[PDB]
Design a protein around this ligand. Structure first.
Ligand SMILES: Nc1ccn([C@H]2C[C@H](O)[C@@H](COP(=O)(O)C(F)(F)P(=O)(O)OP(=O)(O)O)O2)c(=O)n1
Ligand SMILES: [Mg+2]
Length: 321
DNA sequence: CCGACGTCGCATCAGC
DNA sequence: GCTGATGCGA
DNA sequence: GTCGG
């Protein structure tokens, strides 16, 4: 809303930095600028006005001015029309093709999906799956399908061993009406910090033809593809699903962290610091009088975490910030 | 001025 | 063959 | 690219 022309511009600049110039920190700077401007509840009229916001500096101020006085950025217009740069940027939309792989492909004349299709031999396993489901991976998932997906996942996990605890986290857990993928956090009492749990779950999901492809799989993280059964109806798009096995004594921290939002974890993180706490994905530890965290504390639900920091439970419904 | 800017699991590469 | 580095996505 | 030490 409000400054979509500006934030589209900035996001576009961000992508070229990451994908073409391989400048991760500029990618991040542009996205911060785009994010702070997106939340600005006013129609921006000058670069100076924008510069007042944290993350918007002299150069972005200048870019805004040019956009506001012409309706575009010369550099961006040039970048878009550059065959090499535009191709490198495009190829990274394929899961598994990052900035480096895109650059190599474009160097050797491989620039479109058709070219990718023509050169399967030059693609690793992940990249082939990314190519296979290029279109599907870019679709969002309606909440109703996410629930249908949740039904299958919770049912099959409990079927393998009823002592598993499984939680669908991510935007879905925050009640969002659509998701980009499904994230499943999994634990089991026989698995602690101190102490084939994941393989067995993946195998069951494959057995009932829910999981269709594997991108990567180790003892704690699975990254793959799944698909709901089809009704005389259109088949469902294939969807990205992740499954993480976490020790029970870190599980609820993990659930918090992987539920988001990113901005919420930000805000909640600093609060821990104020009251002398370093919360990371895994644990919560107290900062001694020097900057020295001690042991991780007991955590046996999300709330235990809120309590250590004298917060009251925020239902995931409102963890947008 | 100049460095920081977030982190990790898995797949694959580079070097030995 | 092994160990550490790099690429990648989240 | 922007920030801050
Ligand atoms: N650079 C990154 C990016 C992400 N993540 C982790 C940390 C996040 O908890 C997790 C998902 O971030 P997400 O990018 O899918 C999102 F924020 F858009 P979400 O709202 O969760 O969308 P959805 O629920 O539909 O998948 O990836 C990370 O660790 N590093
Ligand atoms: Mg996601």
């Amino acid at each position: 809303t409000l400054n979509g022309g500006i934030t589209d511009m900035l996001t576009e600049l961000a992508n070229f930095e990451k994908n073409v110039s391989q400048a991760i920190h500029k990618y991040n700077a542009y996205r911060k600028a785009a994010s702070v401007i997106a939340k600005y509840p006013h129609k921006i009229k000058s670069g100076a006005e924008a510069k007042k916001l944290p993350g918007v500096g002299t150069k972005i101020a200048e870019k805004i001015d040019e956009f506001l006085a012409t309706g575009k950025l010369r550099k961006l217009e040039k970048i878009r029309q550059d065959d090499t740069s535009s191709s490198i940027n495009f190829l990274t939309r394929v899961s598994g093709i990052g900035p480096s792989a895109a650059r190599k492909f474009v160097d050797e004349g491989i620039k479109t999906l058709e070219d990718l299709r023509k050169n399967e031999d030059k693609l690793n396993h992940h990249q082939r799956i990314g190519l296979k489901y290029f279109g599907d991976f870019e679709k969002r998932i309606p909440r109703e399908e996410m629930l249908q997906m949740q039904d299958i996942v919770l049912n099959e996990v409990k079927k393998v061993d009823s002592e598993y605890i499984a939680t669908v986290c991510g935007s879905f857990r925050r009640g969002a009406e659509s998701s980009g993928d499904m994230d499943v956090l999994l634990t089991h009492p026989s698995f602690t910090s101190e102490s084939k749990l994941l393989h067995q779950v993946v195998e069951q999901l494959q057995k009932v033809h829910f999981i269709t492809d594997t991108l990567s799989k180790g003892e704690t993280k699975f990254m793959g593809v799944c698909q709901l059964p089809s009704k005389d109806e259109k088949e469902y798009p294939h969807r990205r699903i992740d499954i993480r096995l976490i020790p029970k004594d870190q599980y609820y921290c993990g659930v918090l962290y992987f539920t988001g939002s990113d901005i919420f974890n930000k805000n909640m993180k600093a609060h821990a610091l104020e009251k002398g706490f370093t919360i990371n994905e895994y644990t919560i530890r107290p900062l001694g009088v020097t900057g020295v965290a001690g042991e991780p504390l007991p955590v046996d639900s999300e709330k235990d975490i809120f309590d250590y920091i004298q917060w009251k439970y925020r239902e995931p419904k409102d963890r947008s910030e």
